[PDB]
Amino acid sequence: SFQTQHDPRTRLGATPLPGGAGTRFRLWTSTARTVAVRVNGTEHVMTSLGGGIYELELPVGPGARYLFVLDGVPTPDPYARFLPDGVHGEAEVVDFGTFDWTDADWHGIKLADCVFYEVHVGTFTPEGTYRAAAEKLPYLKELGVTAIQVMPLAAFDGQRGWGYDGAAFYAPYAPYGRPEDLMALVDAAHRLGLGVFLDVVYNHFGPSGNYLSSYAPSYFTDRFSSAWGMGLDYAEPHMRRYVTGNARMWLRDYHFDGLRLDATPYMTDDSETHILTELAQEIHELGGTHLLLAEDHRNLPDLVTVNHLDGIWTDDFHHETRVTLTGEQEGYYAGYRGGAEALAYTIRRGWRYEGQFWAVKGEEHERGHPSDALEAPNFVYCIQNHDQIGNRPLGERLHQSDGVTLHEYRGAAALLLTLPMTPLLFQGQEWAASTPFQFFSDHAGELGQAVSEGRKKEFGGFSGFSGEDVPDPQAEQTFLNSKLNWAEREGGEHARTLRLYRDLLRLRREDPVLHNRQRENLTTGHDGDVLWVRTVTGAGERVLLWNLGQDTRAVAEVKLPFTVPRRLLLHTEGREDLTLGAGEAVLVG
């Protein structure tokens, strides 16, 4: 009985009309006294309908260029579907019905079948475009990942950026390609049987290019704010519909298979029906198999059980793993001991913090909720992602941090990719890429000059930010140094690491016991610095043993509360015998 709040007839922005009649322009403004649309340079007064809604139909088609004129001030359309000259320019009218899709028989992907691969379009290839990314899809299919996780595409200011400064949520960022280039990427992924997910940012707008307040200040509220901008007022239905209409566009019009909702703790809403619940209703109304995930640090099961999201990016696993390997304790890493026993516990519980005191300085509070309701696929785990690389002072990858060996890096991959939780990999992780992933931006004027100090303040708990070698986010070189080097994977230890990732992803796909997706069938423990993870189903038994010590441990001498299986299925260093050098792992069955 849920009825969508969206009807193409009343869609805000510029929408092509049936029968070649042109385009319908609509906006909401609470404050303007004169309202016009300027199309291809010509101004036309719009009709007032009441409730601050204005409309006009004109015989212009796709490709027409426009903005709105509010009390004589030319103002970009917040509902723009494309901004070819950037966030301060004219929008282009887009028709979503002309692209020739070939994915009519694609039926999406289930979360339990997802192995995510996080892509930043600008750095993923030299060209930094959708078209170039599409040419790497056969490589990703063969690698064995099943869903691409694309970092945000909403238009932001400047010529490069991560995406979290997006300001025009409906307009794919022009430097990456035109709307049809994005559609071609998704179509190509679906032809290869790969899902495609999009990172969307519904907790804040970026600091340049957000003109919503020019139309109605009440899109926003001073009731609360995030670390990155003013509060989006989800008590205002037009604000709710801004993001639910956006979600529906990506899924329906661009054929994405799911969305990853950035920083859901800062989507503050005290409405009877929470905006997250309504987002789920609105995307489900499309009548497909589209998924919603939350990036949420609160360890709150209700995101799944009440808001009806499909899963949660949960960092406790990542953090416990990193601290295990480095011993680092700055910032949020002070929340974790690390080690085999600690990792066994965090896996057993899904997340570590279920209501106990988080004792980190300046942050002391009771964190989290019981994880019991959540099943394995509801937890998205990783050992690398954009934040856990890029928010480090020098943007170094896990194998690049002091004290981490490539053997430890390879062992960590085996843990991640054999667990029944839903894994994510960051681009280049699979070949132990040599390049960092640094924070880069390209803002104009004083805003641009402020980025570096904003970073140092936001991450001031990390002493490396007060050093002298922090890469300037605004420098071209910082962007270029984050580009993947595709050549390097063909040789040496990059190739060795890649072979292991291929072998792990094959086993995950093929092994009848690792097909398990039930926490009931998963147990963990430790003996000294050796972690064990056991899966038992009707199909048999598997055990992963990871030696997190700096000595050698024979599997036969690991004390276990069950009889260890005898058959060696995969060793991370390709050894014949059941013995674990420092940092090494083995899967037995």
Ligand X SMILES: OC[C@H]1O[C@H](O[C@H]2[C@H](O)[C@@H](O)[C@H](O)O[C@@H]2CO)[C@H](O)[C@@H](O)[C@@H]1O
Catalytic (active-site) positions: 262, 295
296 among annotated binding-site residues:
no
Distance CA 214, CA 69 (A): 10
Residue 130: strand, helix, or coil: helix
Provide CB contacts within 8 A for 383, sequence distance 6+: 318, 321, 322, 398, 412, 413, 416, 429
Closest to Mg ion by CB, 436 vs 528, is 528
Residue 207: strand, helix, or coil: coil
Subset of residues 313 to 342 that bind Mg ion, contact rule: CB under 5 A? none
Burial class (CB in 10 A: 0-12, 13-18, 19+), 166: buried
Burial class (CB in 10 A: 0-12, 13-18, 19+), 210: buried
Is 462 among the residues that bind ligand X (CB under 6 A)? Answer: no
Partner whose footprint covers residue 486, from Mg ion, ligand X, none (CB < 5 to 8 Å by kind): none
Backbone angles phi, psi at 520, to 5 degrees: -55, -30
Q: How far is the CB of 576 from ligand X (least distance, A)?
A: 27
| Residue nearest ligand X by beta-carbon distance | 454
427 among annotated binding-site residues:
no
What is each CA distance from 585 to 421, 442, 536, in whole angstroms?
Answer: 18, 42, 19
- Written as six digits, the tokens of 266 are 């800062």
Task: Select from 97-105, 175-183, 404-412, 571-579 the region that touches ligand X (CB under 6 A).
Answer: 97-105
Distance CA 153, CA 163 (A): 6
Closest to ligand X by CB, 61 vs 461, is 461
Subset of residues 230 to 259 that bind ligand X, contact rule: CB under 6 A? 251, 255-257
Alpha helices per DSSP H over 377-511: 386-390, 406-418, 445-458, 476-480, 492-510
User: x/- contact string, 498-517, with ligand X (CB under 6 A)?
Assistant: --------------x--xxx
Partner whose footprint covers residue 320, from Mg ion, ligand X, none (CB < 5 to 8 Å by kind): none
Closest to ligand X by CB, 40 vs 518, is 518
State the first-to-last Cα distance of the chain, in angstroms, to the nearest integer. Answer: 49
Is 208 among the residues that bind ligand X (CB under 6 A)? Answer: yes
Is 210 among the residues that bind ligand X (CB under 6 A)? Answer: yes
109 among annotated binding-site residues:
no
Partner whose footprint covers residue 371, from Mg ion, ligand X, none (CB < 5 to 8 Å by kind): none
Q: Kind and range of the H or E element at 358? A: strand 354-358
Distance CA 542, CA 586 (A): 10
Backbone angles phi, psi at 283, to 5 degrees: -80, -35
388 among annotated binding-site residues:
yes
Among 44, 88, 131, 496, interactor with ligand X by CB under 6 A: 88
Partner whose footprint covers residue 361, from Mg ion, ligand X, none (CB < 5 to 8 Å by kind): none
Count of Cβ atoms closer than 10 Å to residue 271 Cβ: 13
Closest to ligand X by CB, 299 vs 307, is 299
565 among annotated binding-site residues:
no
For ligand X, the binding residues (CB under 6 A) are 3, 5, 7, 9-10, 88, 101, 103-104, 106-108, 112, 162, 164-165, 190, 207-211, 214, 228, 251, 255-257, 287-290, 297, 315, 327, 332, 337, 339, 358, 360, 363, 367, 387, 391, 439, 441, 451, 454-455, 458, 512, 515-518, 529, 537-539
Interface with Mg ion (CB under 5 A):
387, 527-528
